PDB file of all heavy atoms in Angstrom:
ATOM      1  N   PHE A   1      85.917  76.547  29.261  1.00  0.00           N
ATOM      2  CA  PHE A   1      86.452  76.136  27.969  1.00  0.00           C
ATOM      3  C   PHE A   1      87.620  75.180  28.150  1.00  0.00           C
ATOM      4  O   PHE A   1      87.702  74.149  27.473  1.00  0.00           O
ATOM      5  CB  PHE A   1      86.874  77.366  27.164  1.00  0.00           C
ATOM      6  CG  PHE A   1      87.893  77.076  26.097  1.00  0.00           C
ATOM      7  CD1 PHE A   1      87.513  76.497  24.899  1.00  0.00           C
ATOM      8  CD2 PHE A   1      89.227  77.392  26.288  1.00  0.00           C
ATOM      9  CE1 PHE A   1      88.446  76.233  23.913  1.00  0.00           C
ATOM     10  CE2 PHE A   1      90.164  77.130  25.307  1.00  0.00           C
ATOM     11  CZ  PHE A   1      89.773  76.549  24.118  1.00  0.00           C
ATOM     12  N   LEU A   2      88.537  75.506  29.064  1.00  0.00           N
ATOM     13  CA  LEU A   2      89.698  74.644  29.276  1.00  0.00           C
ATOM     14  C   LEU A   2      89.274  73.284  29.815  1.00  0.00           C
ATOM     15  O   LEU A   2      89.847  72.253  29.444  1.00  0.00           O
ATOM     16  CB  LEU A   2      90.687  75.312  30.231  1.00  0.00           C
ATOM     17  CG  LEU A   2      91.640  76.350  29.639  1.00  0.00           C
ATOM     18  CD1 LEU A   2      92.505  76.948  30.734  1.00  0.00           C
ATOM     19  CD2 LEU A   2      92.499  75.745  28.538  1.00  0.00           C
ATOM     20  N   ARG A   3      88.281  73.265  30.705  1.00  0.00           N
ATOM     21  CA  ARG A   3      87.820  72.013  31.294  1.00  0.00           C
ATOM     22  C   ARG A   3      87.088  71.144  30.279  1.00  0.00           C
ATOM     23  O   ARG A   3      87.158  69.913  30.357  1.00  0.00           O
ATOM     24  CB  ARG A   3      86.918  72.299  32.495  1.00  0.00           C
ATOM     25  N   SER A   4      86.384  71.757  29.329  1.00  0.00           N
ATOM     26  CA  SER A   4      85.511  71.024  28.421  1.00  0.00           C
ATOM     27  C   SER A   4      86.175  70.624  27.107  1.00  0.00           C
ATOM     28  O   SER A   4      85.498  70.050  26.248  1.00  0.00           O
ATOM     29  CB  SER A   4      84.256  71.852  28.126  1.00  0.00           C
ATOM     30  OG  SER A   4      83.616  72.252  29.325  1.00  0.00           O
ATOM     31  N   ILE A   5      87.461  70.905  26.916  1.00  0.00           N
ATOM     32  CA  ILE A   5      88.154  70.573  25.673  1.00  0.00           C
ATOM     33  C   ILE A   5      88.999  69.325  25.905  1.00  0.00           C
ATOM     34  O   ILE A   5      89.967  69.343  26.673  1.00  0.00           O
ATOM     35  CB  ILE A   5      89.005  71.742  25.157  1.00  0.00           C
ATOM     36  CG1 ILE A   5      89.878  71.284  23.987  1.00  0.00           C
ATOM     37  CG2 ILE A   5      89.873  72.331  26.257  1.00  0.00           C
ATOM     38  CD1 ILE A   5      90.191  72.378  22.996  1.00  0.00           C
ATOM     39  N   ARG A   6      88.621  68.231  25.258  1.00  0.00           N
ATOM     40  CA  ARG A   6      89.406  67.007  25.228  1.00  0.00           C
ATOM     41  C   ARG A   6      90.002  66.807  23.837  1.00  0.00           C
ATOM     42  O   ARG A   6      89.497  67.354  22.851  1.00  0.00           O
ATOM     43  CB  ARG A   6      88.545  65.796  25.621  1.00  0.00           C
ATOM     44  N   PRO A   7      91.094  66.042  23.724  1.00  0.00           N
ATOM     45  CA  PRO A   7      91.736  65.871  22.408  1.00  0.00           C
ATOM     46  C   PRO A   7      90.838  65.297  21.318  1.00  0.00           C
ATOM     47  O   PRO A   7      91.005  65.652  20.147  1.00  0.00           O
ATOM     48  CB  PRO A   7      92.923  64.945  22.716  1.00  0.00           C
ATOM     49  CG  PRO A   7      92.568  64.260  23.987  1.00  0.00           C
ATOM     50  CD  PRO A   7      91.765  65.251  24.771  1.00  0.00           C
ATOM     51  N   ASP A   8      89.908  64.405  21.643  1.00  0.00           N
ATOM     52  CA  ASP A   8      89.041  63.872  20.595  1.00  0.00           C
ATOM     53  C   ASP A   8      88.107  64.931  20.012  1.00  0.00           C
ATOM     54  O   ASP A   8      87.923  64.994  18.791  1.00  0.00           O
ATOM     55  CB  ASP A   8      88.231  62.694  21.139  1.00  0.00           C
ATOM     56  N   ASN A   9      87.523  65.780  20.858  1.00  0.00           N
ATOM     57  CA  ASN A   9      86.538  66.774  20.439  1.00  0.00           C
ATOM     58  C   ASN A   9      87.108  68.159  20.109  1.00  0.00           C
ATOM     59  O   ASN A   9      86.419  69.158  20.362  1.00  0.00           O
ATOM     60  CB  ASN A   9      85.441  66.888  21.497  1.00  0.00           C
ATOM     61  CG  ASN A   9      85.960  67.389  22.818  1.00  0.00           C
ATOM     62  OD1 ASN A   9      86.526  66.629  23.592  1.00  0.00           O
ATOM     63  ND2 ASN A   9      85.795  68.676  23.073  1.00  0.00           N
ATOM     64  N   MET A  10      88.332  68.276  19.577  1.00  0.00           N
ATOM     65  CA  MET A  10      88.775  69.615  19.180  1.00  0.00           C
ATOM     66  C   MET A  10      87.879  70.237  18.114  1.00  0.00           C
ATOM     67  O   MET A  10      87.847  71.467  17.993  1.00  0.00           O
ATOM     68  CB  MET A  10      90.205  69.673  18.617  1.00  0.00           C
ATOM     69  CG  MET A  10      91.353  69.906  19.599  1.00  0.00           C
ATOM     70  SD  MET A  10      92.964  69.317  19.011  1.00  0.00           S
ATOM     71  CE  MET A  10      93.104  67.673  19.667  1.00  0.00           C
ATOM     72  N   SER A  11      87.166  69.423  17.333  1.00  0.00           N
ATOM     73  CA  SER A  11      86.334  69.954  16.257  1.00  0.00           C
ATOM     74  C   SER A  11      85.213  70.851  16.775  1.00  0.00           C
ATOM     75  O   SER A  11      84.922  71.893  16.174  1.00  0.00           O
ATOM     76  CB  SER A  11      85.753  68.803  15.435  1.00  0.00           C
ATOM     77  N   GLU A  12      84.560  70.467  17.877  1.00  0.00           N
ATOM     78  CA  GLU A  12      83.419  71.248  18.354  1.00  0.00           C
ATOM     79  C   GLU A  12      83.839  72.645  18.795  1.00  0.00           C
ATOM     80  O   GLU A  12      83.131  73.625  18.535  1.00  0.00           O
ATOM     81  CB  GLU A  12      82.722  70.509  19.496  1.00  0.00           C
ATOM     82  N   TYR A  13      84.985  72.758  19.467  1.00  0.00           N
ATOM     83  CA  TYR A  13      85.456  74.023  20.018  1.00  0.00           C
ATOM     84  C   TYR A  13      86.488  74.707  19.130  1.00  0.00           C
ATOM     85  O   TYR A  13      87.197  75.604  19.600  1.00  0.00           O
ATOM     86  CB  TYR A  13      85.998  73.837  21.437  1.00  0.00           C
ATOM     87  CG  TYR A  13      85.040  73.145  22.377  1.00  0.00           C
ATOM     88  CD1 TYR A  13      84.967  71.763  22.450  1.00  0.00           C
ATOM     89  CD2 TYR A  13      84.204  73.890  23.200  1.00  0.00           C
ATOM     90  CE1 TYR A  13      84.082  71.146  23.315  1.00  0.00           C
ATOM     91  CE2 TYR A  13      83.322  73.280  24.068  1.00  0.00           C
ATOM     92  CZ  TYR A  13      83.264  71.907  24.122  1.00  0.00           C
ATOM     93  OH  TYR A  13      82.388  71.291  24.985  1.00  0.00           O
ATOM     94  N   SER A  14      86.588  74.303  17.859  1.00  0.00           N
ATOM     95  CA  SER A  14      87.569  74.903  16.959  1.00  0.00           C
ATOM     96  C   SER A  14      87.403  76.415  16.878  1.00  0.00           C
ATOM     97  O   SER A  14      88.385  77.140  16.684  1.00  0.00           O
ATOM     98  CB  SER A  14      87.452  74.279  15.568  1.00  0.00           C
ATOM     99  N   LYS A  15      86.170  76.907  17.022  1.00  0.00           N
ATOM    100  CA  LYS A  15      85.935  78.345  16.962  1.00  0.00           C
ATOM    101  C   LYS A  15      86.500  79.045  18.193  1.00  0.00           C
ATOM    102  O   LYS A  15      87.110  80.116  18.079  1.00  0.00           O
ATOM    103  CB  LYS A  15      84.442  78.632  16.802  1.00  0.00           C
ATOM    104  N   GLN A  16      86.308  78.463  19.380  1.00  0.00           N
ATOM    105  CA  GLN A  16      86.769  79.093  20.611  1.00  0.00           C
ATOM    106  C   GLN A  16      88.272  78.953  20.823  1.00  0.00           C
ATOM    107  O   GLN A  16      88.816  79.625  21.706  1.00  0.00           O
ATOM    108  CB  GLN A  16      86.052  78.520  21.845  1.00  0.00           C
ATOM    109  CG  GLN A  16      84.529  78.734  21.969  1.00  0.00           C
ATOM    110  CD  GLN A  16      83.693  78.075  20.882  1.00  0.00           C
ATOM    111  OE1 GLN A  16      84.096  77.987  19.729  1.00  0.00           O
ATOM    112  NE2 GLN A  16      82.507  77.612  21.258  1.00  0.00           N
ATOM    113  N   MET A  17      88.953  78.106  20.048  1.00  0.00           N
ATOM    114  CA  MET A  17      90.399  77.969  20.186  1.00  0.00           C
ATOM    115  C   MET A  17      91.156  79.207  19.725  1.00  0.00           C
ATOM    116  O   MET A  17      92.359  79.308  19.991  1.00  0.00           O
ATOM    117  CB  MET A  17      90.902  76.755  19.400  1.00  0.00           C
ATOM    118  CG  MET A  17      90.338  75.418  19.842  1.00  0.00           C
ATOM    119  SD  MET A  17      91.642  74.201  20.116  1.00  0.00           S
ATOM    120  CE  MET A  17      92.445  74.193  18.514  1.00  0.00           C
ATOM    121  N   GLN A  18      90.493  80.140  19.047  1.00  0.00           N
ATOM    122  CA  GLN A  18      91.117  81.389  18.636  1.00  0.00           C
ATOM    123  C   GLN A  18      90.866  82.525  19.613  1.00  0.00           C
ATOM    124  O   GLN A  18      91.715  83.415  19.745  1.00  0.00           O
ATOM    125  CB  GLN A  18      90.617  81.799  17.246  1.00  0.00           C
ATOM    126  N   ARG A  19      89.725  82.514  20.303  1.00  0.00           N
ATOM    127  CA  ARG A  19      89.432  83.539  21.298  1.00  0.00           C
ATOM    128  C   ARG A  19      90.259  83.368  22.564  1.00  0.00           C
ATOM    129  O   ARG A  19      90.483  84.347  23.282  1.00  0.00           O
ATOM    130  CB  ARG A  19      87.940  83.514  21.640  1.00  0.00           C
ATOM    131  CG  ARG A  19      87.467  84.654  22.527  1.00  0.00           C
ATOM    132  CD  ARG A  19      85.943  84.770  22.508  1.00  0.00           C
ATOM    133  NE  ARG A  19      85.320  84.993  23.813  1.00  0.00           N
ATOM    134  CZ  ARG A  19      85.694  85.890  24.718  1.00  0.00           C
ATOM    135  NH1 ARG A  19      86.680  86.744  24.493  1.00  0.00           N
ATOM    136  NH2 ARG A  19      85.050  85.941  25.880  1.00  0.00           N
ATOM    137  N   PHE A  20      90.732  82.155  22.845  1.00  0.00           N
ATOM    138  CA  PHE A  20      91.461  81.872  24.071  1.00  0.00           C
ATOM    139  C   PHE A  20      92.905  81.456  23.835  1.00  0.00           C
ATOM    140  O   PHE A  20      93.602  81.125  24.801  1.00  0.00           O
ATOM    141  CB  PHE A  20      90.733  80.786  24.873  1.00  0.00           C
ATOM    142  CG  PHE A  20      89.434  81.247  25.470  1.00  0.00           C
ATOM    143  CD1 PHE A  20      88.266  80.535  25.256  1.00  0.00           C
ATOM    144  CD2 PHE A  20      89.380  82.396  26.238  1.00  0.00           C
ATOM    145  CE1 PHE A  20      87.071  80.959  25.803  1.00  0.00           C
ATOM    146  CE2 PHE A  20      88.188  82.823  26.789  1.00  0.00           C
ATOM    147  CZ  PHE A  20      87.032  82.104  26.570  1.00  0.00           C
ATOM    148  N   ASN A  21      93.372  81.463  22.584  1.00  0.00           N
ATOM    149  CA  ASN A  21      94.778  81.217  22.258  1.00  0.00           C
ATOM    150  C   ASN A  21      95.248  79.857  22.776  1.00  0.00           C
ATOM    151  O   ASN A  21      96.321  79.733  23.370  1.00  0.00           O
ATOM    152  CB  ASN A  21      95.668  82.346  22.786  1.00  0.00           C
ATOM    153  CG  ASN A  21      97.083  82.283  22.242  1.00  0.00           C
ATOM    154  OD1 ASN A  21      97.316  82.513  21.055  1.00  0.00           O
ATOM    155  ND2 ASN A  21      98.036  81.970  23.111  1.00  0.00           N
ATOM    156  N   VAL A  22      94.433  78.827  22.564  1.00  0.00           N
ATOM    157  CA  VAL A  22      94.788  77.457  22.918  1.00  0.00           C
ATOM    158  C   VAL A  22      94.714  76.600  21.664  1.00  0.00           C
ATOM    159  O   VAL A  22      93.683  76.578  20.982  1.00  0.00           O
ATOM    160  CB  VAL A  22      93.856  76.893  24.005  1.00  0.00           C
ATOM    161  CG1 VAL A  22      94.006  75.382  24.106  1.00  0.00           C
ATOM    162  CG2 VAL A  22      94.129  77.550  25.341  1.00  0.00           C
ATOM    163  N   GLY A  23      95.802  75.895  21.363  1.00  0.00           N
ATOM    164  CA  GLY A  23      95.785  74.904  20.306  1.00  0.00           C
ATOM    165  C   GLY A  23      97.008  74.890  19.411  1.00  0.00           C
ATOM    166  O   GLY A  23      97.348  73.850  18.840  1.00  0.00           O
ATOM    167  N   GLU A  24      97.685  76.031  19.284  1.00  0.00           N
ATOM    168  CA  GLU A  24      98.847  76.116  18.409  1.00  0.00           C
ATOM    169  C   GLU A  24     100.145  76.284  19.191  1.00  0.00           C
ATOM    170  O   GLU A  24     100.929  75.338  19.316  1.00  0.00           O
ATOM    171  CB  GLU A  24      98.681  77.272  17.420  1.00  0.00           C
ATOM    172  N   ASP A  25     100.378  77.491  19.710  1.00  0.00           N
ATOM    173  CA  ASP A  25     101.605  77.753  20.456  1.00  0.00           C
ATOM    174  C   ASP A  25     101.672  76.918  21.724  1.00  0.00           C
ATOM    175  O   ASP A  25     102.750  76.464  22.124  1.00  0.00           O
ATOM    176  CB  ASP A  25     101.694  79.239  20.796  1.00  0.00           C
TER     177      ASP A  25
END
């Protein structure tokens, strides 16, 4: 998940950004 998330494509992984606590804090 960390390797496959780039700033342009946050939309695709928006669901997984809550299971792994990446994106806000």
Side-chain angles (χ1 to χ4, degrees), residues 1-2 4-5 7 9-10 13 16-17 19-23:
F1 158 78
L2 278 178
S4 306
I5 171 151
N9 64 280
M10 270 157 267
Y13 307 85
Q16 296 63 325
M17 299 230 303
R19 188 165 137 48
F20 290 127
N21 191 69
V22 166

